[PDB]
Amino acid sequence: AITSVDSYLLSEIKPRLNTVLENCYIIDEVLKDFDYQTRESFKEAFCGKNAQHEVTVGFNFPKFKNNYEAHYLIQLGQGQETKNSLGSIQSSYFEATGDTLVESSTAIREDDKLVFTVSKPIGELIKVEDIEFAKYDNLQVEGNKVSFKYQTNEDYENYNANIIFTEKKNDSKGLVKGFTVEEQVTVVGLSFNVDVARCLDAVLKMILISMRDSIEEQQTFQLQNLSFGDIAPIIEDGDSMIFGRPTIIKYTSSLDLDYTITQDINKLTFKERKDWK
Amino acid sequence: AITSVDSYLLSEIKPRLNTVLENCYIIDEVLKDFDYQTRESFKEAFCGKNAQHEVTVGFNFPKFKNNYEAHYLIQLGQGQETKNSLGSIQSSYFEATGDTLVESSTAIREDDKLVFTVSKPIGELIKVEDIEFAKYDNLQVEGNKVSFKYQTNEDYENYNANIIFTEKKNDSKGLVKGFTVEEQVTVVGLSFNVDVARCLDAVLKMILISMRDSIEEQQTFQLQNLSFGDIAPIIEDGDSMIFGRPTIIKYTSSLDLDYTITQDINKLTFKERKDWK
Amino acid sequence: LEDQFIGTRTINTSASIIKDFIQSYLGRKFPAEDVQVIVEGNEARISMTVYPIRSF
Amino acid sequence: ASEAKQTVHTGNTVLLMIKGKPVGRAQSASGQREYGTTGVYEIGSIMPQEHVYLRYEGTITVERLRMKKENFADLGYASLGEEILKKDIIDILVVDNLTKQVIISYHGCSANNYNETWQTNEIVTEEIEFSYLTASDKA
Amino acid sequence: ASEAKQTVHTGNTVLLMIKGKPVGRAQSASGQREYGTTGVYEIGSIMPQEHVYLRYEGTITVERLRMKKENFADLGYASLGEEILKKDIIDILVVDNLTKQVIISYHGCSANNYNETWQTNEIVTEEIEFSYLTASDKA
Amino acid sequence: ASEAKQTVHTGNTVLLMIKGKPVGRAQSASGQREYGTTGVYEIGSIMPQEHVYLRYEGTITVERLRMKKENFADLGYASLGEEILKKDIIDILVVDNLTKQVIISYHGCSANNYNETWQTNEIVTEEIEFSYLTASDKA
Amino acid sequence: NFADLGYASLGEEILKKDIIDILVVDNLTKQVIISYHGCSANNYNETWQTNEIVTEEIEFSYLTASDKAR
Amino acid sequence: NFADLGYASLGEEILKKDIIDILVVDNLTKQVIISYHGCSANNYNETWQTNEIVTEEIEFSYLTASDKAR
Amino acid sequence: ASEAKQTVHTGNTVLLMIKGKPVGRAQSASGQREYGTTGVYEIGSIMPQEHVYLRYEGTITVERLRMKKENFADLGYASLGEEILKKDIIDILVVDNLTKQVIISYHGCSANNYNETWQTNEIVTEEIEFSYLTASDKAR
Amino acid sequence: ASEAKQTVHTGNTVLLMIKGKPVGRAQSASGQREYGTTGVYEIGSIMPQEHVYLRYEGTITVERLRMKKENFADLGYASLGEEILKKDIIDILVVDNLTKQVIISYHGCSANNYNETWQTNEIVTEEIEFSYLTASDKAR
């Protein structure tokens, strides 16, 4: 697909940041190496459900004033294409496949089959969690349902699973044409308190490590690489300075389009014609 | 873990600096190559218990005035990730282990065992100083105690040892996920006297050499590498100039998280099911 | 037949790794198509298909 | 956005597992494989008439940073001395990190050589090479 | 402006096709060919009198990024184990991307070796080499 | 913060000791080891049936800056001339710097070759290679 | 094979063979280059190897040779 | 081994052996390719080496050979 | 494979022993055996009607690096001169290195020839050949 | 291992001596010995009933680089013509280089053949073969 690393990072960082900040012992583990008073002050101010201060995330160049006490500024950077395929053919498909998804589901009995229902039509099934079927189990997929023979499996009549699968758009042939790009995004934790900037740096590094395992950047946005700048005053001529430490996140990812092929051939036919010269 | 090289350096330098400055013959050895008058003036001013002047250490950008006669300014610098593991698996553990520790302890008799008591639960024992046990000695560890058979060892009933060990957090499985970072910190000895700046440089180099053997940067913060700047006026438009010579300390270290695994499997079970076709 | 492992000797195991391990055991020692693995909680039920003799 | 229709494996996507433990700090794995394909020639033409497979061979080579604990020597997979004579064959699995699903299995690995390099500005490196009896994948 | 009177093929201009499917993410193809040309010498001069062709040989080598699906192993063209004995010869076509017109055909390919490299800062790489019976082009 | 659960050895972490003296200014040590693993083949299949260990071999190579005193020649471990015939085997220990605990022992070392390079913009370098009878670690 | 085509013998059947002519022939024109006339087998040999193609070798004594076919 | 399987002899026991048939067989179909009939041992040989696999070699004279089993 | 699990014997899996002591520095041993097998022919067929055994013969050859002590000459298993007349026949065993179970005995070995070679820059070598009476899967 | 501690003899650990002087430039020596060992057979068994020694024979071969002086011809240990008739038998010793203890004596050596080779770009070589009467662990 076409991709937007900045919007991915914003969408991914915001919930993760919230879920760490609402959970005190996580911060208590992340900041174990800092000075005791720095740790306790940060945990008192920003952390837990009762926290009176709050962190914020957003892109650069807003028209309004931000929460300069603690704010992650996201800032789309450079990139370059790095590796190309022969013919620019990144892949080919017989059935137009969408995004990868993971969904929780439960088995149910139906007509002496077990079935799992999924919210969308299954274009491909990658894994039913914790199950490997035998041929006897007569595994079949149909529409948005996975179906599974009941006879030997009655104990599992309410078994709970996670389905990893991917959508289908439509039944069509084509070529995925495109290339790989290596692209940079900068993130900086602004604070007018230097110890807050240092803690926001630690929290961001933890978040990015945790992010490396996510499906989003396992399937796309691969090879996350981190670089770190000096701590410096971002703005120097207010009633106080504003500090931050930049980090650069670099990703390798595919830019591509679905070139559908309308041509289809369904029968050869043969004829002999005679040359009398 | 997540780590903070700047706070490590501050915590490590301050006590070492104090303990050198309170000990005259150490300075007399460190400064043996300097001019006699420089050496004696420094030793008179800053050194020994009666020293009327004092050195100081702290981070950059304080809001107050510092002791510009002699002050080590610590200044967090750049870094970059350098080496990655396959799957980002830095290690794996069956029991969540804390920091490494070294503690002095003495043996005591208890129920015809010798035991050493340690301040914290022993997650792993690395070394009992100056002892290698035989199988006959029936070495066992339990909770926060090390225990050791009395029968043949009665002469050692009050033996004094150092225990090198590491804490345990909890009994859980997981993967240590993370990567290695190479990171820089700058340190500069500010003085309005140039000969004091040169002596503070010498003392700092001695301190860093001594630091290379510490457990902190043996286990983490490995491969200390030093670079040195020119001596120059840091500030030039007071009633006097302030001089300093920067040094850059570069460290290689691991950034990682404990990804605990809740899944555990404790019995396989087998069944045969018959296919009548 | 039985082969069994217990006692925390492993990390991060999955139903696929169990099935391959069984085939490593069997291959060094019946078809991989003919065996099923279900993992649930702490239990891995391994089920082998077998062919009883029908009369013509 | 995450798409399956194109995806490549990467150093972060793949676990290496031995005896059900992941190998920490593995730096590379290189699998090589050869069939001895020999061409058939005869009087009457310069062209090859046929190709035949005659001898399967393969090796797996692993480079790793030497940890202070759980080395290949401490794990027992490597051998420093005569105790090589007492090591049974082991199976090395390369596994998808997301799905925990086996990508390729190397069966019957047996050590050819083992190296350690101690150097003054670097982390210490283990390297080991195994001959193996066969490789397979299952899906 | 687009001129035919001069034009060169480029990585973007050329499809690689096997069994009527394009090979995605192929990084290179290298075709090599040898005729065994032997010079004839005799008593009476140092000069070669003649050259003769005695033995045709050639190989096609392909490097590819290891996809998560439709690998050479998943496509079945490569072989990891004894099942190499059950793979029939395949024909590899290099085809003009614009005209869909065959540039060169390698006929009767048969695998010599197969490699995979797993490395920590890189995409995983497949590489495969085939001996082939002949090559041809048609126009 | 200092953690044991992950740690790697580094040039600063490891002492090299010979006869209970540390070797100053050692620049590298390289240990190599080989078992002669030979594959067994037979009529009836192309697959290897088994692997056997047949011949152990190993070497330790050390590079060092040539000191003005306590060279390998001055220490007597190296030999320049016929006095090589009068040097008994020596054991080389690689030891943890923190714990003073033996990481690996090379037993029965015997010198293969000895080099010195004198060059105009560099410190002089010794290099020496030993064959050894066995290696071991103890824990 | 020679055994399958009946040009070689393994046992008593050698007594029921008869002499044969072997031709070496121009590959382009199929003109004969050499005929060996009245070939009769002296010995026949086979070798089996772990990782090689199986080989046959046969030796015939012959009566005469000519630039032409019989 | 041949000694363990009773197909070879080390001493007097050679006198109590009797002739055997050796088959070379198609690995796919298990169809016989060649039978050697009535094999009887001529010599038997062993070699031991410092760093190699031990080898056996045996030679039989035989009465007849055939495209088929007896 | 473990030495306990190899299907084939190898040089490290076996020992050579004489009079209950292991023969050190043994480089190789070669054992040969012939039965004099002769085919019988008669008028009316070109083919051998049967084969018959006539004369058993066998030789065992041993090659070693010459030690400074405990050579064959020093151990009294070889002869240089008249002393050959005062030797008597010996049994040579090849033995499983793990279990010390006998693999082969050669019975009644008697020396045929004895050979030495000296070289500028090589280890000195000994080679000895014995004819023997019989061989067995077991000790005498 | 130290030369004092090697278990095997090597070319540097031994000397070759004739008439109490060391033979310089010696490249190789080969000593061979045969006893004529013959097996006895009789009607009623296919197997040798015993082996007996019949005829001792032995030869010592020595090969050297030809020196400009003190060749075998110059030292009088070899012959080119009639002078062979006026030679007499000599003893050749192989001796421990450290202790000068004798390792082997060959007694009563008499020359069989003598050989020389000249080459464009190589060191000249001598080879000589003696038959000898007996050998011993000790000097005469």
Automatic annotation (TrEMBL), chains A, B:
Domain of life: Viruses
Source species: Staphylococcus phage 812
Official protein name in the record: Baseplate hub assembly protein
InterPro entries named in the record: SP10_terminator (IPR056960)
Automatic annotation (TrEMBL), chain C:
Taxonomic superkingdom: Viruses
Name used for this protein in its record: Major tail sheath protein
Organism listed in the record: Staphylococcus phage 812
Upper classification of the organism: Viruses, Duplodnaviria, Heunggongvirae, Uroviricota, Caudoviricetes
TrEMBL record, chains I, J:
Superkingdom of the source species: Viruses
A Pfam family hit: Phi812_tail_tube
InterPro entries: Phi812_tail_tube
Record protein name field: Capsid protein
Organism: Staphylococcus phage 812
